[PDB]
Write a protein that binds this ligand. Structure first.
Ligand code: MG
Ligand code: MG
Lengths: 326, 329
């Protein structure tokens, strides 16, 4: 019975676009996270900061967290490597020392150039990575070194604009070497599947702003998922999402944790009558404000050319236009 | 009495790397060959890291006679391109060496290194101290509508240490970050070559190069003839199976071929080799009643180009030995 946060052991929660939007914590994020009893794990695909450094930034925004609460893709990459390299194998680092620490912390030996004999290469974003560093990695990868990337985001959003992400640095090595790296962070399920293993949790939940990492990774991990609308992807994006990227729950922001799990769920709605016609989904009337989104989403998924969403009365049109959809 | 290929031409647009020298050492007979040509020797490179004088200095060390005026770079062609569609004094963000920036300055545009300055264009070339913050600056310019030019799009820089990331790898990072492509100013874009003949009003230029996708592709794009040499990247196999736009007109071992007959070097049918094209195979036999060792390459190439991938088989022993010498089988 009761709220969704109570129905689940622990929450794997995305940071960026979910907890905080750059400088500021999200809509009622601080208030809402203090009121859950379930174990809160902060999940980030970024590998530039270390475990503590991320927790410090949370503390500066008014949240209570330490490094043991945070799950980075640098940590998951470290486990991946140690999972298939001899103890004290040499791993060439591309990225910050926060990355190289996690390599050391799993009993491997972080290295910085190709004349040292690295059995693998790990790659995460660092704002001082230069050509010289890529060149060392390029030689290593051409010689058959095992290549891991923390994440493969093409862009890094900031106040100045959309800057090059780790995926862009990976794209340079892809071109130089003609090979791909194995991706360690989201949307790979190992990151999430390990996080639940830490505290042997039997009923975990994923909360994130982004379909192609947070939600896609949840389904890959065989976990449920609550999509929030404070970040990258929109209501529209959820409706037309391809099967592997479809969330199970959907809500405004982190106040959704204290809402009823049956209310947030993507399913048919008694408040909305929907008819899938010839190339169109039609909505008539009979709520936090997202019921109609859940109604339409559910219809499209159950059912190629994208289906048009269209209105059957004044009450439908106004709600739809409020969420775009036409 | 016959006439050499170099005598038949006003000027020679000669590629540096893989053609004149191979990293440290001049290629076979390069110094002795170029010293014996009367016509104008221009040294063309797609690299935008060295200045024209720095290139010429490097050539003097290896044993060649060359000044800065003899060098044609993609950095020059990139600058000329930008000057040709930007107002004088327009700001151009530089990704690359100061030698790149100097070429931009020299055409009356203002070289720049960051997005807070308002750059109308981004020019990209390889520099070994290029870092993420430099790419970040250019990413912001490109997204803000800035005109983007690259010197070259080479995935790799070949060095003594191995294969390092070329300018094409750096571009790929911006291709991914921005979702846009640069306009290429260097080879195989014909602007580079066609402007070089304009410099001296030459009326019978020839291109010499080791690479099909740049040197040769550009020569066909510029409507110039072209000698492919086997000292560099592309081989005889590559010549044979090259698609129409990357086909050379002449083919030789190395820069010695500048003194051989153009009729001998020409990709054409050969007296010493009879060819049967049929059954998805090219059968080569030794024929009935002087070779430089490449007649069979020219015969096969000519046969393949005149006519679904095609196999190359030997009809007798002599032909098999010749074919095996150039792989081909
Ligand atoms: Mg996010
Ligand atoms: Mg070359």
């Amino acid at each position: 019975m009761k709220s969704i946060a109570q129905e689940h052991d622990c929450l794997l929660i995305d940071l960026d676009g979910t907890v905080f939007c750059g400088r500021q914590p999200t809509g009622g994020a601080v208030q809402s996270l203090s009121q859950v009893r379930s174990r809160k794990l902060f999940v980030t695909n970024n590998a530039s900061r270390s475990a503590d450094e991320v927790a410090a930034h949370l503390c500066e925004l008014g949240f209570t967290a330490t490094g043991e609460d945070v799950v980075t893709s640098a940590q998951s990459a470290a486990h991946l490597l140690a999972g298939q390299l001899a103890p004290g194998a040499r791993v060439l680092i591309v990225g910050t020392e926060a990355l190289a620490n996690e390599v050391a912390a799993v009993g491997l030996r972080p290295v910085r150039r190709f004349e040292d004999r690295p059995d693998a290469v790990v790659q995460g974003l660092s704002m001082t990575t230069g050509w010289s560093d890529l060149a060392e990695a390029a030689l290593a990868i051409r010689a058959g070194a095992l290549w891991v990337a923390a994440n493969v985001d093409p862009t890094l959003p900031t106040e100045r604009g959309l800057l090059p992400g780790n995926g862009s640095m990976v794209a340079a090595l892809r071109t130089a070497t003609g090979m791909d790296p194995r991706v360690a962070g989201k949307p790979a399920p190992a990151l999430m599947t390990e996080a639940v293993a830490r505290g042997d949790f039997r009923a975990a939940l994923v909360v994130g702003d982004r379909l192609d990492t947070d939600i896609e990774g949840a389904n890959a991990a065989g976990l449920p998922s609550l999509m929030v609308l404070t970040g990258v992807n929109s209501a529209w994006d959820a409706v037309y999402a391809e099967p592997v990227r479809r969330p199970t729950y959907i809500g405004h922001d982190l106040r959704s944790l204290h809402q009823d799990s049956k209310l947030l769920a993507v399913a048919p709605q008694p408040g909305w009558q929907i008819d899938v016609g010839g190339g169109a989904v039609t909505v008539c009337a009979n709520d936090d404000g997202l019921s109609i989104v859940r109604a339409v989403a559910s219809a499209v998924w159950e059912a190629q050319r994208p289906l048009r969403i269209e209105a059957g009365d004044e009450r439908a049109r106004a709600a739809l236009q409020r969420w775009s959809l036409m």
